[PDB]
Design an enzyme around this catalytic site. Structure first.
Site, PDB file in Angstrom:
ATOM      1  N   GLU A 177       0.828  -1.209   0.000  1.00  0.00           N
ATOM      2  CA  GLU A 177       0.000   0.000   0.000  1.00  0.00           C
ATOM      3  C   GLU A 177       0.874   1.277   0.000  1.00  0.00           C
ATOM      4  O   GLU A 177       0.696   2.144  -0.849  1.00  0.00           O
ATOM      5  CB  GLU A 177      -0.893   0.055   1.263  1.00  0.00           C
ATOM      6  CG  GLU A 177      -2.019  -0.971   1.340  1.00  0.00           C
ATOM      7  CD  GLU A 177      -3.060  -0.767   0.289  1.00  0.00           C
ATOM      8  OE1 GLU A 177      -3.187   0.361  -0.228  1.00  0.00           O
ATOM      9  OE2 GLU A 177      -3.748  -1.745  -0.039  1.00  0.00           O
TER      10      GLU A 177
ATOM     11  N   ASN B 240      -7.575   9.873  -5.835  1.00  0.00           N
ATOM     12  CA  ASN B 240      -8.487   8.969  -6.543  1.00  0.00           C
ATOM     13  C   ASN B 240      -9.453   9.739  -7.448  1.00  0.00           C
ATOM     14  O   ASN B 240      -9.780  10.896  -7.183  1.00  0.00           O
ATOM     15  CB  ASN B 240      -9.270   8.080  -5.554  1.00  0.00           C
ATOM     16  CG  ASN B 240      -8.370   7.230  -4.681  1.00  0.00           C
ATOM     17  OD1 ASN B 240      -8.375   7.363  -3.472  1.00  0.00           O
ATOM     18  ND2 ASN B 240      -7.586   6.375  -5.288  1.00  0.00           N
TER      19      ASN B 240
ATOM     20  N   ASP C 257     -12.565   9.769  -7.762  1.00  0.00           N
ATOM     21  CA  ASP C 257     -13.782  10.256  -7.136  1.00  0.00           C
ATOM     22  C   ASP C 257     -13.556  11.443  -6.218  1.00  0.00           C
ATOM     23  O   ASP C 257     -14.474  11.865  -5.516  1.00  0.00           O
ATOM     24  CB  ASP C 257     -14.448   9.113  -6.369  1.00  0.00           C
ATOM     25  CG  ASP C 257     -13.685   8.723  -5.097  1.00  0.00           C
ATOM     26  OD1 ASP C 257     -12.453   8.922  -5.023  1.00  0.00           O
ATOM     27  OD2 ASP C 257     -14.333   8.214  -4.161  1.00  0.00           O
TER      28      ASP C 257
ATOM     29  N   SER D  41     -11.495  11.508  -3.572  1.00  0.00           N
ATOM     30  CA  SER D  41     -10.987  11.087  -2.267  1.00  0.00           C
ATOM     31  C   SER D  41      -9.472  10.900  -2.357  1.00  0.00           C
ATOM     32  O   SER D  41      -8.907  10.906  -3.463  1.00  0.00           O
ATOM     33  CB  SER D  41     -11.635   9.764  -1.837  1.00  0.00           C
ATOM     34  OG  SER D  41     -11.288   8.692  -2.700  1.00  0.00           O
TER      35      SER D  41
ATOM     36  N   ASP E 188      -6.129   8.599  -0.331  1.00  0.00           N
ATOM     37  CA  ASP E 188      -5.698   7.553   0.599  1.00  0.00           C
ATOM     38  C   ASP E 188      -4.519   8.144   1.368  1.00  0.00           C
ATOM     39  O   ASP E 188      -3.623   8.755   0.782  1.00  0.00           O
ATOM     40  CB  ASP E 188      -5.256   6.293  -0.152  1.00  0.00           C
ATOM     41  CG  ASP E 188      -6.310   5.801  -1.119  1.00  0.00           C
ATOM     42  OD1 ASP E 188      -7.473   5.697  -0.696  1.00  0.00           O
ATOM     43  OD2 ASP E 188      -5.997   5.556  -2.301  1.00  0.00           O
TER      44      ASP E 188
ATOM     45  N   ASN F 166      -8.730   5.662   3.301  1.00  0.00           N
ATOM     46  CA  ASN F 166      -9.483   6.566   2.440  1.00  0.00           C
ATOM     47  C   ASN F 166     -10.367   7.635   3.090  1.00  0.00           C
ATOM     48  O   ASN F 166     -11.174   7.329   3.968  1.00  0.00           O
ATOM     49  CB  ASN F 166     -10.318   5.710   1.473  1.00  0.00           C
ATOM     50  CG  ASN F 166     -10.939   6.526   0.346  1.00  0.00           C
ATOM     51  OD1 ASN F 166     -12.094   6.954   0.429  1.00  0.00           O
ATOM     52  ND2 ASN F 166     -10.174   6.728  -0.725  1.00  0.00           N
TER      53      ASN F 166
END
EC number: 3.2.1.17
Length: 129
Positions: free
Chosen positions: A35, A46, A48, A50, A52, A59
């Site tokens: 990750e 991301n 959308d 958002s 991380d 998220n």
């Protein structure tokens, strides 16, 4: 901060992740490796809107508040910045909540593709725990 594999294994063990909800320590170290490559400051935008955050790439759509993810949820009750700390306490506490929210470790696709079912003890060998 960037952790060496064993350093992280020790911190995670101290914070009670070993066998937490059925997942042995190595699973958590392995998830961290794929990750964020053990970097506490990793961030990733991301499609959308958002992002991380941190060592476990938590998220902002559901778990933390960053003030810039329109119509999101803050379920860990934490500003996303707390997840970029050198102290993994915030990250670990929130990951314990995510894993408890039904899904197990399936929240991390990298874990599912690179860790699940493999010899996870490899991630803690050579460390003195």
């Amino acid at each position: 901060k960037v952790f060496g594999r064993c350093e992280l294994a020790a911190a995670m063990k101290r914070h009670g992740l070993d066998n937490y909800r059925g997942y042995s320590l190595g699973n958590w170290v392995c998830a961290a490796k794929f990750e964020s490559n053990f970097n506490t400051q990793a961030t990733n935008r991301n499609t959308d809107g958002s992002t991380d955050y941190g060592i476990l790439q938590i998220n902002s759509r559901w778990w933390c508040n960053d003030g810039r993810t329109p119509g999101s949820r803050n379920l860990c009750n934490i500003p996303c910045s707390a997840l970029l700390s050198s102290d993994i306490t915030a990250s670990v506490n929130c990951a314990k909540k995510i894993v408890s929210d039904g899904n197990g470790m399936n929240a991390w696709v990298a874990w599912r593709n690179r860790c699940k079912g493999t010899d996870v003890q490899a991630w803690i060998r050579g460390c003195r725990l």
